[PDB]
């Protein structure tokens, strides 16, 4: 059996998956995650996969830091690296969801004239995080630590304007009867790295 290596976390809007190396050859893996409180909990048992979805555990407390470990076990009609005793494992880097999960790509839900403005509404994407029993939207999780930044321009001139909101609503001025294009981006101002999502697809009304 070959101990697992390159344990990395893949996380977007809290959906979290631990990945690792190598594709198994005559071995299976069992993954454990611990709320840094020590007490480990196996989540993926004797699998040939090289990834394990741990969303169920991290979303119990996104601000808490998490530790994971992958155990290697002999598989199939074979010997046993040792005496069928202490399997080869490996711990993962630490992971604090709130601070490290990537911000998913936003989606503009609609455009509507309101008074002399155009109301651009961002879809409040629900996540797997749950408080009391309700699935929390990304806004619920971050509160005001999340800003949506809008970019908009007339397709003819390409002159760009930008606006920000810490709700999911924008109220902006646009020249009447002109075709505009819009793109929205998510940002967590308090972060110093990985603070920006990729831009929503350009929508030219």
């Amino acid at each position, epitope marked *: 059996t070959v101990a697992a290596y390159n344990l990395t976390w893949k996380s977007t809007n809290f959906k979290t998956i631990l990945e690792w190396e190598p594709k198994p050859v005559n071995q299976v893996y069992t993954v454990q995650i611990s709320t840094k409180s020590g007490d480990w909990k196996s989540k993926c048992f004797y699998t040939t996969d090289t990834e394990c979805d741990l969303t169920d555990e991290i979303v119990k407390d996104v601000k808490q830091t998490y530790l994971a470990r992958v155990f290697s076990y002999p598989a199939g009609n074979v010997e046993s690296t040792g005496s069928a005793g202490e399997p080869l494992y490996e711990n993962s880097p630490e992971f604090t969801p709130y601070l490290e999960t990537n911000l998913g790509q936003p989606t503009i839900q609609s455009f509507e004239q309101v008074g002399t403005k155009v109301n651009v509404t961002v879809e409040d994407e629900r996540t797997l995080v749950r408080r009391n029993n309700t699935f929390l939207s990304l806004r619920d999780v971050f509160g*005001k630590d999340l*800003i949506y*930044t809008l*970019y908009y321009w007339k397709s003819s001139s390409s*002159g*760009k*304007k*930008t*606006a*920000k*909101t810490n709700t999911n609503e924008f109220l*902006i001025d646009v020249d009447k009867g002109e075709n505009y294009c819009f*793109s929205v*981006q998510a*940002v967590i*101002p308090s*972060r*110093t*790295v*990985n*603070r*920006k999502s*990729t*831009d929503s697809p350009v929508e030219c009304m």
Partner: antibody
Amino acid sequence: QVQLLESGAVLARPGTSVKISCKASGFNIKDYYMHWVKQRPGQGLEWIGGNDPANGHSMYDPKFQGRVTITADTSTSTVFMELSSLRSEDTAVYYCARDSGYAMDYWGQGTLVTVSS
Amino acid sequence: DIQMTQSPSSLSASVGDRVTITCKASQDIKSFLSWYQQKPEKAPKSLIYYATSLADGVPSRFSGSGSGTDYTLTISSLQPEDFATYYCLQHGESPYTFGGGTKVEIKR
């Protein structure tokens, strides 16, 4: 540690162009919005425009649109402001500033651009 | 476009005083109002953002207040290093606009 270092002072003749830069370090400029602010001798601060290096979008104040171009080079962590058809009113100190979303949290020390014949 | 009217353009104070500087926006800017301090020949420095949030390491002598169109920057227990020029900035939507500035000078 976050720092913004502006290129040196420059003298330019009326009608020509000038391109100043700002070297960022201690962070990735594609994670922020980089802006340029000018201050004429004895006057206040005035927003010129800025750029989002993650997508290339540049925004310019209507008064400068047409003769200012703001670009970024992510491989060298440098942002630039090029201003053309230079005139006297353009003589000023230009500051590079980082927009974190809620604030222009970091500023360069400013570059003096003198436009004179 | 949003206009910012900052006042007063100049104010006189003594060490220990409490002074208030105001910025009124031409429309509701939803607290995307920040304040900066600038001393002669120095670059501006962030004091307060999102109307009332004190920036990292900035003295508690600085506080901000407001929502809608009206905002204030108050400096309490005014200290010698506080005499300088102050600017508000609306940057919730471009074009971004600075107030005209307020120079806080020494009374005698």
